Design a protein around this ligand. Structure first.
Ligand SMILES: [Ag+]
Ligand SMILES: [Ag+]
Ligand SMILES: [Ag+]
Length: 653
C-alpha cells in the first residue's frame, strides 16, 4: 500500500506491458510520449533536445511502431520528424498505457511491425450524481514546472470530463557544465462528453487542442509551433446478443499544424547554409475510423472488424528577398498539397481457450493501401517526375500464438509466429532526395516492408519473486533504410530497400526480499544486420541494464536506480533513418538516481528525486548529431542532462 516511484515497468501478460502513466517516474519524463516509454525495457529514445524524442523499439523506429491515442491515430507533419507522434501525447493526461511487442496483433491498424502502443482513457463510472479531481504539480532544476488537471462530473446517465496540462523547461546543462539548446513548452486541453443511456450503452464525444515549442540541439531549425486539433466520436454496445458481447464503432479527426524556423528560438547562424530568416510551415490532416464486433461463446472469443484511414500533408515556406532584406512569412503564401494516403483494412482475431492452462490465438488482416503524390514541383525549383501519380498495394498480415501454463509452477510459456507487411509512409516516400539507384525518385520505387518474426518467452508470477523474459528472431524483407552522402553542399538522403535479420530480447525480475525491501532488474538487447550489404543495421541501441532497490515502510518509500549501458561497436556509418545516421562507436556509461515518496493524506502524496546523482557526462548512441551553429563539433551528438532535482505533489478527490 506504500507509495512508489516508477524506475521500470514489468511485463504482466505474454508480450504485453500495462502501466498507469499518472505515477512518478524516476528518470523524470519531459512530459512527452517517448519519455514515458524509456521506463519499459526494449525502448530507447533519439534525443533531439530537451523534449520530443523519437521512440525506438527493439531497434525499430518510426512507423514500424503503431502509436494509438484513444484508438485514434495522430501523425505529425515535419518532413524531418521534429514532431514524432509521441510529441503530441501528454501521458499523464491518459489513464492506461499498454504495449504489445512484436507483430502479434491485428486489431489496431496496418503494419505494426515492431509493436503497438495504446494510450487510453477508461470512461467514467458514475452512479449517483458526483465528481472527481486528480491533479499534480512538478518543479525541478532548470526552470522545469508542470501542471496537470483531470476533473469530471456526471451521474448514471452521462458525464463531462476535462483534461489539461501545462509544461515547460529551460535549457538544461550536461555533465560538463555546458548548457544545451533545449528549452521547451507544451500545453493541452481536451474535453469529453459521455452519454450512458443504460448500462449496456456508451456514446462519447471528445475534442481537444494543444500547442508547443521546442529548441533543437541538432536540426539547424527549431520548432516554434506544434498546434494539434482533435475531434473524436465513439460508440460501444454491450451484450446485444447472447454471443455478441460487444460492438464498438469509432471515428476520429486529427490535425497537426507545425512551424519550424531559425529566428524565433535562436538567432540565424550568420555563417551557415541559412544566414537569412526562414520558416517552413507544414500540416497533416487525419480522418479515420474503426468498427469491430466481439463474439464470445463456448471456449472461443472472436473479434472481427474493418478500419479505414485517410491523411493529407501540405506545406508552405517563407521567402527572403536578399537585396531588399525584406522577409515574407510563410502564412503569406498558399498551401501546396503534396501527399494523400488512404488505407482500408479488415481483420479478425480468434482465441481458443483449450481449457485450463492452454491458450491459442490467431489473427489475420488484409489491407489496401494507396498514396498519391501531389507535388507539382520540387526544391531553385525543378519538375517532379511523379506528379499526380498513384501507387497502391494489397498487403496481408497475421499471427499465431500459443500460450501454456505449467502444472507445478505459476509459470506461463509462450511462442508465436507473426508476419506483418507495411506500406511505406510519408517520410520514406517524400523526404529522401534520392530513391534506389536507377529510380526516378523514392515515391516511384520504394517497396513495402515485409517482416516475419518469431516471438517467445515466459512469465513466473510466483510470490516473493516475479520474473519475465521475451525473445525474438526475425527476418525483414525490403527493410527501408536511409543513407547519407556529402556532395559538397548540404546532406542528401537516399532511401533503399535491403534485407535484414534481427534478433534480441528483454528480461527482468523483481524479488521481494523482506516486507520492506524489494529489488528488481532488467536487461534489454537488440541486434540487427543488413544482409544485402553484409554489415550491421544502423541506429541499434546497445545492451542496457537497470537495477533498482526500494525500501517501503508505512506511508513512505525510498528508491535507488543504476542504469548501465554497454558500448555499441556494431554500427553502419552514414546510414540510419530519416532522423539520424550512425557515425561512431559509442562509449558505455552508468547513471545513478534516488527518489522518495511520502503519502500525506489519502488525497495528497509527495515525491522527489535526484536524476544523475554523480553528474555523469554522457551521450546515448542514438542521439542526434549536434548542430554546427551552437557549440557542437563534427558529428558530436547532443549529450544527456547532468544532475537534476525534481519534486512533485499528486492530488486525488
Ligand atoms: Ag520541423
Ligand atoms: Ag532552414
Ligand atoms: Ag535561406
Amino acid at each position: 500500500l506504500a507509495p512508489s516511484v516508477v524506475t521500470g515497468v514489468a511485463q504482466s501478460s505474454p508480450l504485453t506491458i500495462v502501466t498507469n502513466p499518472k505515477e512518478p517516474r524516476q528518470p523524470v519524463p519531459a512530459s512527452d510520449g517517448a519519455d514515458y516509454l524509456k521506463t519499459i525495457p526494449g525502448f530507447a529514445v533519439i534525443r533531439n533536445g530537451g523534449s520530443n524524442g523519437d521512440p525506438v523499439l527493439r531497434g525499430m523506429f518510426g512507423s514500424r511502431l503503431n502509436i494509438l491515442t484513444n484508438g485514434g491515430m495522430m501523425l505529425g507533419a515535419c518532413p524531418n520528424r521534429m514532431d514524432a507522434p509521441t510529441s503530441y501525447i501528454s501521458p499523464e493526461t491518459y489513464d492506461k498505457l499498454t504495449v504489445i511487442k512484436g507483430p502479434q496483433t491485428v486489431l489496431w491498424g496496418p503494419g505494426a511491425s515492431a509493436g503497438t502502443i495504446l494510450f487510453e482513457r477508461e470512461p467514467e463510472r458514475f452512479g449517483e450524481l458526483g465528481s472527481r479531481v486528480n491533479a499534480s504539480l512538478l518543479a525541478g532544476s532548470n526552470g522545469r514546472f508542470d501542471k496537470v488537471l483531470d476533473a469530471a462530473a456526471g451521474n448514471r446517465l452521462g458525464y463531462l470530463r476535462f483534461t489539461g496540462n501545462h509544461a515547460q523547461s529551460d535549457d538544461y546543462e550536461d555533465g560538463a557544465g555546458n548548457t544545451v539548446p533545449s528549452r521547451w513548452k507544451k500545453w493541452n486541453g481536451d474535453v469529453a462528453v459521455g452519454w450512458t443511456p443504460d448500462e449496456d450503452t456508451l456514446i462519447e464525444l471528445t475534442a481537444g487542442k494543444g500547442d508547443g515549442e521546442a529548441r533543437y540541439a541538432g536540426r539547424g531549425m527549431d520548432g516554434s509551433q506544434f498546434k494539434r486539433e482533435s475531434l473524436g466520436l465513439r460508440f460501444v454496445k454491450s451484450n446485444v446478443s447472447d454471443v455478441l458481447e460487444k460492438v464498438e464503432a469509432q471515428v476520429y479527426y486529427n490535425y497537426a499544424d507545425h512551424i519550424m524556423d531559425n529566428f524565433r528560438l535562436r538567432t540565424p547562424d550568420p555563417s551557415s547554409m541559412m544566414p537569412m530568416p526562414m520558416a517552413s510551415q507544414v500540416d497533416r490532416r487525419t480522418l479515420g475510423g474503426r468498427l469491430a464486433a466481439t463474439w464470445r461463446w463456448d471456449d472461443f472469443k472472436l473479434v472481427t472488424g474493418v478500419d479505414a484511414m485517410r491523411n493529407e500533408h501540405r506545406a508552405r515556406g517563407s521567402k527572403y528577398d536578399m537585396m531588399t532584406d525584406y522577409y515574407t512569412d510563410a502564412d503569406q503564401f498558399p498551401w501546396s498539397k503534396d501527399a494523400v494516403f488512404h488505407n482500408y483494412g479488415a481483420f479478425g482475431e480468434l482465441t481458443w481457450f483449450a481449457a485450463e492452462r492452454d491458450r491459442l490465438i490467431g489473427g489475420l488482416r488484409l489491407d489496401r493501401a494507396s498514396v498519391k503524390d501531389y507535388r507539382q514541383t520540387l526544391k531553385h525549383a525543378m519538375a517532379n517526375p511523379t506528379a499526380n501519380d498513384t501507387r497502391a498495394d494489397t498487403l496481408p498480415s497475421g499471427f499465431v500464438r500459443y500460450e501454456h501454463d505449467l502444472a507445478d509452477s505459476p509459470t506461463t510459456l509462450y511462442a508465436g509466429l507473426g508476419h506483418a507487411e507495411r506500406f511505406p509512409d510519408y517520410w520514406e516516400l517524400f523526404s529522401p532526395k534520392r530513391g534506389p539507384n536507377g529510380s526516378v525518385n523514392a515515391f516511384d520505387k520504394i517497396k513495402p516492408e515485409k517482416t516475419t518474426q518469431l516471438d517467445f518467452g515466459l512469465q513466473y508470477n510466483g510470490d516473493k519473486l516475479q520474473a519475465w523474459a521475451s525473445g525474438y528472431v526475425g527476418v525483414v524483407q525490403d527493410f527501408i533504410l536511409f543513407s547519407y552522402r556529402e556532395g559538397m553542399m548540404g546532406s542528401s538522403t537516399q532511401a533503399t530497400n535491403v534485407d535484414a535479420r534481427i534478433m534480441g530480447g528483454e528480461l527482468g525480475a523483481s524479488y521481494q526480499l523482506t516486507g520492506n525491501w524489494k529489488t528488481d532488474a532488467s536487461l534489454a538487447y537488440a541486434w540487427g544486420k543488413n544482409s544485402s550489404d553484409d554489415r550491421a543495421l544502423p541506429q541499434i541501441p546497445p545492451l542496457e541494464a537497470r537495477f533498482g532497490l526500494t525500501y517501503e515502510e508505512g506511508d513512505w518509500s525510498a528508491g535507488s536506480l543504476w542504469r548501465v549501458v554497454a558500448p555499441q561497436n556494431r554500427i553502419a556509418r552514414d546510414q540510419g533513418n530519416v532522423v539520424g545516421k550512425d557515425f561512431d562507436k559509442s562509449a558505455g556509461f552508468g547513471v545513478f538516481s534516488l527518489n522518495g515518496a511520502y503519502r500525506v493524506t489519502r488525497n495528497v502524496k509527495l515525491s522527489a528525486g535526484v536524476d544523475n546523482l554523480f553528474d555523469k557526462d554522457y551521450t546515448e548512441h542514438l542521439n542526434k548529431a549536434g548542430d554546427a551553429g551552437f557549440g557542437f563539433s563534427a558529428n558530436e551528438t547532443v549529450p544527456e542532462p547532468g544532475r537534476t532535482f525534481w519534486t512533485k505533489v499528486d492530488f486525488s478527490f
